[PDB]
Short mmCIF file of C-alpha atoms and ligand atoms in Angstrom, two decimals:
data_model
loop_
_atom_site.label_atom_id
_atom_site.label_comp_id
_atom_site.label_asym_id
_atom_site.label_seq_id
_atom_site.Cartn_x
_atom_site.Cartn_y
_atom_site.Cartn_z
CA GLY A 1 -59.70 -32.30 42.32
CA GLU A 2 -61.99 -31.87 45.40
CA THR A 3 -64.57 -29.04 44.76
CA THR A 4 -66.36 -29.46 48.18
CA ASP A 5 -67.23 -26.13 49.94
CA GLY A 6 -65.14 -25.44 53.12
CA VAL A 7 -61.61 -24.32 54.16
CA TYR A 8 -58.29 -25.64 52.75
CA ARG A 9 -54.57 -25.45 53.55
CA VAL A 10 -52.25 -24.17 50.78
CA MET A 11 -49.14 -26.50 50.89
CA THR A 12 -45.75 -26.55 48.98
CA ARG A 13 -42.92 -29.18 48.80
CA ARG A 14 -40.41 -26.71 47.21
CA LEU A 15 -38.86 -26.17 50.71
CA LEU A 16 -37.79 -28.89 53.25
CA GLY A 17 -40.70 -31.30 54.00
CA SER A 18 -44.26 -30.02 53.19
CA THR A 19 -44.72 -26.33 54.30
CA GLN A 20 -48.15 -24.59 54.82
CA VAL A 21 -47.64 -21.28 52.88
CA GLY A 22 -51.32 -20.23 53.55
CA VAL A 23 -55.11 -21.09 53.66
CA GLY A 24 -58.15 -20.59 51.36
CA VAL A 25 -61.95 -20.87 51.05
CA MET A 26 -63.68 -23.12 48.47
CA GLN A 27 -67.24 -21.82 47.68
CA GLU A 28 -69.46 -22.32 44.57
CA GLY A 29 -66.55 -24.14 42.76
CA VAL A 30 -64.20 -21.10 43.19
CA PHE A 31 -61.13 -21.20 45.53
CA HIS A 32 -60.51 -17.84 47.33
CA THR A 33 -57.11 -17.01 48.84
CA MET A 34 -54.72 -14.07 49.40
CA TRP A 35 -52.39 -13.11 46.48
CA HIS A 36 -49.18 -13.18 48.68
CA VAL A 37 -49.85 -16.93 49.49
CA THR A 38 -49.91 -18.32 45.87
CA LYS A 39 -48.27 -15.30 44.08
CA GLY A 40 -51.06 -15.93 41.47
CA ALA A 41 -49.48 -19.40 40.75
CA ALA A 42 -51.65 -22.44 39.73
CA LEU A 43 -52.67 -25.01 42.45
CA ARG A 44 -53.23 -28.83 42.50
CA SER A 45 -56.14 -30.76 44.13
CA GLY A 46 -55.74 -34.57 43.82
CA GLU A 47 -54.51 -34.69 40.20
CA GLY A 48 -56.85 -31.76 39.30
CA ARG A 49 -55.53 -28.23 38.53
CA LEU A 50 -56.96 -24.85 39.67
CA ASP A 51 -55.93 -22.01 37.34
CA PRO A 52 -56.08 -18.36 38.53
CA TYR A 53 -59.14 -16.47 37.12
CA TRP A 54 -58.90 -13.05 38.96
CA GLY A 55 -56.42 -11.34 41.27
CA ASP A 56 -55.17 -7.94 42.45
CA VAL A 57 -51.92 -7.34 44.43
CA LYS A 58 -53.24 -4.14 46.16
CA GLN A 59 -56.47 -5.81 47.51
CA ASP A 60 -54.06 -8.78 48.09
CA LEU A 61 -56.83 -11.21 46.86
CA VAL A 62 -56.94 -14.06 44.22
CA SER A 63 -59.75 -16.41 43.02
CA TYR A 64 -59.28 -19.78 41.15
CA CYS A 65 -61.71 -21.49 38.62
CA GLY A 66 -64.17 -18.54 38.60
CA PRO A 67 -64.87 -14.99 39.79
CA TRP A 68 -64.80 -13.89 43.51
CA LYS A 69 -67.95 -15.33 45.26
CA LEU A 70 -67.70 -13.84 48.83
CA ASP A 71 -69.85 -10.69 49.26
CA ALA A 72 -70.76 -10.80 53.03
CA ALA A 73 -69.59 -7.76 55.18
CA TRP A 74 -68.75 -7.07 58.90
CA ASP A 75 -71.90 -5.28 60.30
CA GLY A 76 -69.61 -2.82 62.20
CA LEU A 77 -71.13 -4.10 65.53
CA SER A 78 -71.35 -7.93 66.14
CA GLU A 79 -68.35 -10.05 67.33
CA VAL A 80 -66.76 -12.26 64.58
CA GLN A 81 -65.07 -15.72 64.40
CA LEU A 82 -61.65 -16.23 62.73
CA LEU A 83 -61.71 -19.89 61.52
CA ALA A 84 -57.92 -19.98 62.10
CA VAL A 85 -56.12 -22.89 60.29
CA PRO A 86 -52.50 -22.72 61.62
CA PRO A 87 -49.60 -24.86 60.23
CA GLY A 88 -49.50 -28.48 61.64
CA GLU A 89 -52.59 -27.76 63.84
CA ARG A 90 -56.39 -28.42 63.41
CA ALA A 91 -58.96 -25.70 62.48
CA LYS A 92 -59.57 -23.44 65.55
CA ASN A 93 -62.37 -20.83 65.83
CA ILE A 94 -61.12 -17.78 67.83
CA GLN A 95 -63.91 -15.24 68.51
CA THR A 96 -63.17 -11.44 68.68
CA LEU A 97 -64.89 -8.03 68.18
CA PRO A 98 -62.92 -6.46 65.29
CA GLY A 99 -61.13 -3.12 65.48
CA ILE A 100 -60.92 -0.67 62.56
CA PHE A 101 -58.29 0.24 59.90
CA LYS A 102 -58.94 4.01 59.32
CA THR A 103 -57.63 4.77 55.74
CA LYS A 104 -57.84 7.92 53.53
CA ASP A 105 -60.22 5.84 51.25
CA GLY A 106 -62.40 4.37 54.10
CA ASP A 107 -62.63 2.32 57.38
CA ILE A 108 -61.98 -1.51 57.25
CA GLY A 109 -62.71 -4.28 59.81
CA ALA A 110 -59.60 -5.42 61.68
CA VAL A 111 -59.07 -8.55 63.87
CA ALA A 112 -56.17 -8.47 66.42
CA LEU A 113 -55.10 -12.15 66.72
CA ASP A 114 -51.42 -13.18 66.26
CA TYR A 115 -50.56 -16.46 64.33
CA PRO A 116 -47.81 -17.70 61.95
CA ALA A 117 -47.77 -16.17 58.40
CA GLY A 118 -48.70 -19.68 57.14
CA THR A 119 -52.22 -18.96 58.64
CA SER A 120 -52.73 -16.26 55.89
CA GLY A 121 -56.06 -16.90 54.03
CA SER A 122 -58.08 -18.34 56.94
CA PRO A 123 -61.63 -16.91 56.78
CA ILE A 124 -63.40 -14.57 59.27
CA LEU A 125 -67.16 -15.43 59.75
CA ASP A 126 -70.44 -13.74 60.86
CA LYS A 127 -73.13 -15.29 63.19
CA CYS A 128 -74.54 -17.19 60.11
CA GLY A 129 -71.16 -18.76 59.06
CA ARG A 130 -70.90 -16.39 56.00
CA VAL A 131 -67.27 -15.41 55.09
CA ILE A 132 -66.80 -11.62 55.64
CA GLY A 133 -63.18 -11.78 54.40
CA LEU A 134 -59.72 -13.23 54.77
CA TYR A 135 -57.24 -13.01 57.63
CA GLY A 136 -53.55 -12.30 56.95
CA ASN A 137 -52.93 -8.74 55.59
CA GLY A 138 -52.19 -5.92 58.08
CA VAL A 139 -49.61 -4.45 60.39
CA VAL A 140 -47.26 -4.91 63.42
CA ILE A 141 -48.29 -2.28 66.08
CA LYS A 142 -46.54 -0.42 68.99
CA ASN A 143 -46.59 -3.71 71.05
CA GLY A 144 -44.66 -5.77 68.41
CA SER A 145 -47.92 -7.80 67.98
CA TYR A 146 -49.96 -8.28 64.73
CA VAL A 147 -53.35 -6.74 63.59
CA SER A 148 -54.88 -8.11 60.29
CA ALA A 149 -57.48 -6.42 58.01
CA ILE A 150 -60.82 -8.12 57.35
CA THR A 151 -59.92 -8.28 53.58
CA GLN A 152 -63.10 -8.79 51.44
CA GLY A 153 -63.32 -8.74 47.61
CA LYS A 154 -66.16 -7.42 45.40
CA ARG A 155 -68.51 -10.03 43.75
CA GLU A 156 -69.94 -9.43 40.17
CA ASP B 1 -45.42 -26.34 42.98
CA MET B 2 -48.43 -25.94 45.34
CA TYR B 3 -51.50 -28.03 46.35
CA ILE B 4 -54.57 -27.73 48.68
CA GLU B 5 -55.95 -30.07 51.45
CA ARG B 6 -59.45 -29.71 53.05
CA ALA B 7 -59.14 -28.50 56.75
CA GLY B 8 -62.81 -28.19 57.84
CA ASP B 9 -66.38 -26.94 57.32
CA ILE B 10 -66.89 -23.16 57.54
CA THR B 11 -69.53 -22.97 60.35
CA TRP B 12 -70.18 -20.60 63.33
CA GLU B 13 -69.15 -22.59 66.52
CA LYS B 14 -71.04 -21.34 69.68
CA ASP B 15 -68.83 -21.11 72.86
CA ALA B 16 -65.45 -20.71 71.03
CA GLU B 17 -62.25 -19.48 72.85
CA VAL B 18 -63.10 -15.68 72.81
CA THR B 19 -59.97 -13.40 72.87
CA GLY B 20 -58.24 -10.38 71.20
CA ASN B 21 -58.92 -6.59 71.51
CA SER B 22 -60.51 -4.03 69.07
CA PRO B 23 -57.94 -1.29 68.26
CA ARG B 24 -58.73 1.76 66.06
CA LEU B 25 -55.50 2.19 63.98
CA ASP B 26 -54.63 4.91 61.40
CA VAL B 27 -53.21 3.03 58.36
CA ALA B 28 -52.07 3.74 54.76
CA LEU B 29 -52.37 1.11 51.95
CA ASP B 30 -49.48 1.32 49.39
CA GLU B 31 -49.53 0.17 45.69
CA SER B 32 -47.81 -3.18 46.76
CA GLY B 33 -50.86 -3.94 49.04
CA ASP B 34 -48.73 -3.35 52.25
CA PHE B 35 -50.51 -1.52 55.17
CA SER B 36 -48.51 0.85 57.45
CA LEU B 37 -49.38 2.84 60.64
CA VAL B 38 -49.96 6.50 59.53
CA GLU B 39 -48.78 8.75 62.43
O1 LIG C 1 -48.81 -9.03 57.68
C1 LIG C 1 -48.70 -9.80 56.73
N1 LIG C 1 -48.57 -11.14 56.90
C2 LIG C 1 -49.04 -11.86 58.01
C3 LIG C 1 -50.22 -12.57 58.00
C4 LIG C 1 -50.65 -13.26 59.15
C5 LIG C 1 -49.92 -13.23 60.30
C6 LIG C 1 -48.71 -12.51 60.36
C7 LIG C 1 -47.93 -12.45 61.53
C8 LIG C 1 -46.78 -11.72 61.53
C9 LIG C 1 -46.40 -11.06 60.34
N2 LIG C 1 -47.10 -11.08 59.22
C10 LIG C 1 -48.26 -11.81 59.21
C11 LIG C 1 -48.74 -9.26 55.31
C12 LIG C 1 -48.09 -10.18 54.27
C13 LIG C 1 -48.24 -9.62 52.86
N3 LIG C 1 -48.56 -8.18 52.88
C14 LIG C 1 -47.74 -7.45 53.85
C15 LIG C 1 -48.06 -7.88 55.27
#
């Protein structure tokens, strides 16, 4: 299957028609998505197969074919771009200055953009197009609207 | 059973549709990986 670097939709045919369950990032031959999209299940690309290599439900991250590759971080200052890939719709950059998830363990980037759950996995970029983490794990706030973490994994 | 399709290059695109605010939220992360507003 296609190994080309860039962003991908995660589709299933288990439901009616073809349904976009999520999104992922191909880099250095490894496919990076969020655990809640695939559930750690294997994926197809053409007639090729991607087998899970790493994953962790709490971080809500999963890599395929190899270890996590994405080590770039929000600088705590600069605006970011969500390369949003919504269901049925073309890739859309949507530029925002991230908020902040304050946790007992530490502060995390947070982007406040609302989109269908099928957009889970779309990357968030810095000014050099480096992926600083994945969109699609956070919280519904006072307003009824959605705020997602900038979820980044650790490289080795 | 689940499959991928390419949806673009990952590139910074100058003059994109800027939007969204920058809230500071107090959150807790549970063992299931589910965030929650700590109040
Ligand atoms: O918040 C989550 N899922 C979403 C991703 C992206 C957009 C959403 C819009 C509304 C509602 N949920 C959304 C996660 C899922 C798995 N961990 C627990 C919360």
